[PDB]
């Protein structure tokens, strides 16, 4: 018998329609409900017994914690159900790597969520989001995809929640991983060729029901001239901690370092990302000396990952040793 | 009778030196002088007459406004010489983007403009630094050189100024340009496989003569819950345009765009980039109705490179129509 | 007034049919025609107007050398015409690459040539070949067009005929090219970021026109423990220039360089490619001594673009020295 | 009291030697002994216990099977030993990747072993060879290497000598591979982001303690034009299986097909590989219809690749289901 699959919708391109079908870059998102979705790829009734429940119609630019808390809690009941095998949610491309790492931290189970979204509306001329919602069910019916972590299938490919990014504009290759895919779906079929090595859903710390809000957290750009005003902003607004987007290896600019500094004796958490985002990382003690100022380095995760993990991280501990520890593990 | 080059200094991790050989990573930035990193490559000799001065010595994420003006206005002088076919400037990776495109910009000379760094001290084990200054002498020297726009010159490419990014943290290969590079440098010779189509250099409409003042521009990153907090803070500090590093195709949350219709009606340009750097560019009137706000968008450029632009177009223009002919130009 | 393009159809994927909507990989290619395939475009309409013409109907791994003169000829033929101000060619991906350089090499004509394809049948669900077809008339529309070489329009990019490979299997983004796009096409518009700096089309010293029949080229592989034996093969058949698809930078087993002597000193033209085909590229006298044994090396031209460039080239010149120089400019 | 590391000289450009600093591509390869090698790096002495030993002293495009079969076995004696914690192999780049893959079927250990190479000889400038010696060593002497099968450290990357390749020529960052670095190695430490899904060493079934004698394997080029004359010449010169390269998703032509049937017949296994090798994979029943004919696909494996794991295989079957089986698990 066929697996019972969830398809959560919450908006984005995927759902959103444009005036003609040569409009595949100018349109409104989030303008379809999840039935009609549905109904748009008939061959899913062959892969999955599925089911449509939209949490929310958004344009995922326009997202909000309290939205990822109400995702990530309808997430784990359904995850708790035993009518439930997998769990699709269609979402908006922006800030779809935001959700997935954030579902990847906290949800404490190992069927398979797959996040799934389309760089062109349903109405333009081959548009790519029929085919992802295939896959992306296709890889949700399959008990080779329990205990993965959270996965995303978009162009053919089974993506890691945790760290893969929105890189390219327009294209429908749009999401890469510094560390490659996992694997691919083709015609129905996965292809493994590769395993996430960092903690993930049920070998996470971290539990989505102990959750009632999170952190406030920032993110600063740093460029040449920057000064320690965003920084100082940003903090004075209430942010726990500060995502320092640096150039290159976390850099911090010498006119800046000394607002950072102060700003941890004043208990924000300073966290070195960078906006060097297509691979490597961030060495502690490289740039700055980490341990002398108390500052923790966000590794190979670009600023708005940083961001969601420092949050997560923050409902468990405000320690700066073992917020390094997490930023190392996950 | 070989051709004349002379190498700007202006310190960086070229110039910087660490505890060992095993210290790739782990070093300090601007600490040699350019007389003894000439003297480091005896081979130089056979490329060209090299002289060397030493401009500044700074860790190029410490770079201020008046650093480039000074670096440009030196660079124009030498341009003028008729004792000078070459111009090389060795400079830290971390803003080295951001100078080779104000120079792109601004330089209206057609002799080479070559700026080189290298991701390793010259005191680790495999420094890439000595090959990378050699390769930069080599098509500084070259006749085909000229005419071509600034060039950089690391990982045994010829890359544009305009367009190339610091994309990758750690290795070697650290820069890259969605556009692909011009060319390769291979045993002292230049190959060539593509030309730029953007207006650089002589054929740009700014002049470095011209220019003796930049006006402020910042940077604000845009994510899940942002808020309009360090866009205000931006420009009640002086900000003249702010550059929105915006998520997907320069999206603007719900809750940010009220803050930035009034910024712009307070007279602050907002020039919608985006955090999606690897490929494609931001479409206008496509995400927010730029029109209707009198916004512009910064097509490829990433946003400390449209920070630059803005900058500069800036000395010469207010009207917005004008500043997204110039994006869409240069 | 719209401009007037001709599309002639050769068979290929886009032109393909699965037996279902699932069926993106396992389909019959060639089996539509090319008036069918112009009315599931109607948006066509608003670009140019267009005719339709069935050269062919083949799978593309199936083309031969005639092919290739009559496809050639025919296209030189409608170049002429002053009814005809675009060509696109709808083709099979498979040999896509070899056709469009041979295109770029053979037509003396700076009309817009475009040769697109698709990676899945126009039967799939969410198939590339509709907006493909869109984009090529949209680009081939385009007095920006003209004078570029032969260009080929897929994933919403304009790429150089010329250096354009089959890269990635059954991904839409299959086309790469190791020295980037040009430009991209986004919703009938062309935006455009480098130019070609390699002679082709209307500054070719080669002409379709006086070409009757091509030379014989084959390719041999080679790898650890490779013999003579397809390389004796291929000449004793007839091979007038046998492309060497090495390893690295066209490096020859020692086992195998007496066969190539031998073969060389016989009349047969050595031509050192490789199969290290992202990017780089084969130096003369690095790996062998090509002046002593008066062999010519491919540049950076992959195993099939070399044999088309040979053949090319040889309908005009029987000179190594000259194949070298027509090797380092085309 | 460090782990006790053997490196396994065998030649190749990190033992290569050039007229001068400036001469990085052209030099000789296999010129340096391993005891040479290592005094250049004393820094190798604070990671672990190294000794040295010369098994060849060879130009790695010029390999035989008896090379592999002999490196091997010395490889299987170490590893056995109880001296020994982990083992280094330097080698050639040109066919470092096929030696690499070899080891990784039939090492039947979870010690660490490492293949490195280098891009630059010892005497160029910027060389890249020692900063990959030390970094190999590195990842050799740590446990956290062990049960991850063969491991290549070059350009700060441990890649998984399953599938990496030989990508790029001249540059430094030469090897890649579709799927993904397994993870990085900066001043000593090694970082990992993922693990691989295939089966290797220690759960492969294959052995070189079983092994003595490889069956002889052939790869043939497909491209357009191409005739049955270099697979026939292969299978009359002693090829127990071939390799078929061909375009796209391991196309065949027609006018091959038949030569292919009768070669099948006469007991030649046909495995479909590409040149193809960025991305993707070769999938069964697709192009061909390898079930009626009783071929075998190559999966995602390059054709060098494809050639060293039918060579494997064939010592233990020649039953083509279970040739596809292998296939699709290593
Ligand atoms: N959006
Ligand atoms: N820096
Ligand atoms: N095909
Ligand atoms: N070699």
Redesign the interface.
Do not use: C
């Given at each position: 018998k066929l697996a019972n699959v969830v398809i959560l919708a919450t908006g984005g391109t995927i759902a959103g329609a444009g005036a003609?079908?040569?409009?595949?870059?100018?349109y409104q998102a989030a303008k379809v409900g999840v039935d009609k979705l549905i109904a748009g790829?008939p061959?899913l009734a062959?892969l999955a017994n599925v089911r449509g429940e939209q949490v929310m119609q958004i344009?995922?630019?326009?997202?909000?914690?309290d939205d990822?808390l109400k995702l990530g809690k309808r997430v784990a009941e359904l995850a708790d159900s035993n009518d439930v095998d997998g769990i699709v949610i269609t979402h908006g491309?922006?800030?779809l790597e935001?959700?997935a790492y954030f579902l990847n931290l906290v949800q404490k189970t190992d069927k398979p969520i797959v996040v799934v979204g389309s760089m062109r509306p349903g109405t333009?001329?081959?548009?790519?989001?029929?085919?992802?919602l295939?896959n992306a069910v296709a890889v949700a019916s399959n008990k080779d995809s329990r205990g993965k972590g959270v996965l995303v299938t978009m162009?053919?490919?089974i993506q890691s929640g945790r760290?893969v990014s929105?890189?390219?504009?327009?294209?429908?290759?749009?999401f890469?991983?510094?560390?490659?895919?996992?694997?691919?779906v083709?015609?129905?079929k996965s292809?493994?060729?590769?395993?996430?090595?960092?903690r993930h859903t049920v070998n996470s710390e971290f539990d989505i029901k102990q959750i009632s809000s999170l952190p406030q957290v920032?993110?600063?750009?740093?460029?040449?001239?920057?000064?320690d005003?965003?920084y100082?902003?940003?903090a004075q607004?209430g942010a726990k901690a500060l995502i320092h987007?640096?150039?290159?290896?976390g850099?911090?600019?010498?006119?800046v370092v000394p607002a950072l500094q102060q700003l941890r004796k004043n208990g924000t958490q300073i966290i070195r990302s960078?906006?060097?985002?297509?691979?490597?990382?961030?060495?502690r003690?490289?740039?700055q000396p980490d341990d002398k100022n108390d500052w923790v380095v966000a590794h190979?995760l670009?600023?708005?990952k940083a961001?969601?993990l420092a949050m997560v991280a923050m409902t468990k501990t405000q320690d700066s040793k073992e917020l390094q520890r997490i930023f190392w593990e996950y």
């Open positions: 003609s079908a040569a409009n595949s870059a100018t790829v061959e062959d344009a995922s630019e326009s997202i909000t914690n990822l491309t922006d800030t935001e959700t333009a001329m081959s548009a790519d989001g029929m085919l992802n295939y162009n053919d490919e760290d929105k890189s390219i504009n327009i294209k429908t290759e749009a890469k991983s510094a560390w490659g895919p996992l694997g691919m083709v015609e129905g292809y493994w060729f590769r395993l996430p090595a960092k920032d993110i600063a750009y740093s460029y040449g001239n920057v000064t005003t965003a100082k902003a940003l607004n987007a640096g150039t290159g290896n850099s911090v600019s010498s006119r960078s906006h060097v985002n297509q691979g490597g990382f961030v060495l003690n490289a740039e190979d670009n600023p708005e961001r969601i």
